[PDB]
Each structure stands twice: as structure tokens, then as C-alpha cells.
């Protein structure tokens, strides 16, 4: 089989209906698609994309056009890994634990219970933020932890990690934005990959 991780780009690059995405097949025509600019949420490349959805369901995600980031390319993940939110496991309402069972709860009840539990926890609280959150969401987690829970126990590393990693990120990454760009990888005479599989 055509085994490329970028195989989906061949669908977007074909000037005719020769190569087509089997998922998008017969789902919609251009006129009924709501199309919005987007950024892939999967990995750190941050590709510009165009999310096309019909009747509230995402049908495809084209590569968009960002010469400074991804030009006009995707990986198959970003192009097609958008169904996670609609596999039926999505949480649709706030849930509360009672009698050992998790049951739907009103937003008011859930908020009140969570606030009571967190206040009763005083400063002995940890905040695992994960890596999925946007920059604003991560800022919200940090602000909540350090203002509301009055704790420094915030960590987005939902993966193997070390204190050395935290020190390195603080010293050499945080605050130092745009130090290296895709345009410079394209020109770097030598690139040394350490612990990284592009």
C-alpha cells in the first residue's frame, strides 16, 4: 500500500478527482461545506489548515497555506485524525461521583462540588495540565493553580520527563520565542537530531 505518512497530501495535490480521500468520499460538495482556518492540534509543527465541516461534523482538514510553517503540506494525522471528538466517548455534561458511580450533574452542582472539594484541599493540590491545552488554556491552568489553589504543582508533562528537563526548558526555551524557524532549518548547513525523530 501507499505507506507515506503524507499520503493525504497527494489527495490535496491532485488537480482532478483521480486521488480522493476514502473518508471524505461522497460526504459533501464545496458549496455546503463550512470552511474555517485552523491549526492542527496534534503535534508541535502547528500546521495551518482548513477545516471543512458539514452539518456540524468535520469532513476533512486540508493543508492550508502557511509558507513560514508548513507551506501546503500535512501529515495524515493532522489531515484525518479529527474524529476523536465524535467517537461516542465524548463527555457531554458535567459528571459527579455519588455512591461510587459517575452520573450526569448540572453545571451549577458540579461547579459547587468541585469548589468545595478544592477549598477543603487547601494548598495540598496538584494540577496535571497535559499537553493538549492551547496556550490560553495552559495559562488558565497555571493561573488557577497559583492564584486559586495557591500551589506551584503545575506540570504539563503527561509523559516521561525529568527535573533536568524542567530546568532546561526554563533556561533555554521559555520566553525565547522564534529563535529558530523553519526557514532556517531549510538553510542550516548541519542539523543534529538528538532524541528526536522528525
Amino acid at each position: 500500500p501507499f505507506q507515506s505518512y503524507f499520503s493525504g497530501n497527494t489527495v490535496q495535490i491532485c488537480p482532478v478527482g483521480a486521488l480522493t480521500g476514502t473518508a471524505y468520499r461522497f460526504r459533501a460538495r464545496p458549496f455546503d461545506l463550512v470552511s474555517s482556518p485552523s491549526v492542527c492540534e496534534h503535534c508541535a509543527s502547528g500546521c495551518a489548515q482548513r477545516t471543512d465541516h458539514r452539518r456540524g461534523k468535520v469532513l476533512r482538514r486540508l493543508a492550508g497555506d502557511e509558507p513560514e510553517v508548513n507551506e501546503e503540506w500535512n501529515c495524515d494525522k493532522g489531515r484525518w485524525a479529527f474524529t476523536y471528538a465524535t467517537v461516542g466517548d465524548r463527555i457531554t455534561t458535567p459528571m459527579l461521583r455519588d455512591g461510587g458511580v459517575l452520573r450526569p450533574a448540572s453545571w451549577s452542582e458540579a461547579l459547587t462540588v468541585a469548589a468545595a472539594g478544592l477549598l477543603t484541599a487547601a494548598g495540598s493540590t496538584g494540577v496535571l495540565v497535559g499537553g493538549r491545552c492551547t496556550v490560553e488554556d495552559a495559562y488558565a491552568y497555571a493561573k488557577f493553580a497559583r492564584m486559586v489553589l495557591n500551589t506551584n504543582d503545575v506540570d504539563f508533562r503527561a509523559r516521561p520527563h525529568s527535573a533536568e528537563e524542567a530546568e532546561f526548558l526554563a533556561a533555554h526555551v521559555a520566553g525565547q520565542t522564534m529563535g529558530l524557524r523553519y526557514a532556517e532549518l531549510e538553510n542550516a548547513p548541519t542539523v543534529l537530531l538528538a532524541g528526536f525523530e522528525p
Binding site: 461522497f26 459533501a28 460538495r29 458549496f31 455546503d32
Partner: protein, 57 residues
Amino acid sequence: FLDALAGFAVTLGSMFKKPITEGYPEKPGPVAPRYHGRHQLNRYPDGLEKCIGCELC
């Protein structure tokens, strides 16, 4: 001038003419052959649906 009373002739004469109303619903009037009524999805003579789902409509 009887001309100023011409209208009385029009209404009176039309009294003795057969009313021109169409008898809907019991005897509905004839719509034009080209009239734009209900859409209809047609089939081929063997029964297959003609609609190929192109969404051009």
C-alpha cells in the same frame, strides 16, 4: 348621458352569465402543464432511482 351608468349594465349583464369560478376542491381547475408543483424523484424503467446524489439540485 347613459354612459355614466354603463357600469350598471356590466354588473347586471354579468348576473345572467354563468359564473366563471373554478370548482376547487370538488372540481379543481386545470393548472398549466409546465406548472412548478411538487418536486419528484424519478426512477428508471427497471426501478432504479435516477438520483445519483450529485447535489447539483
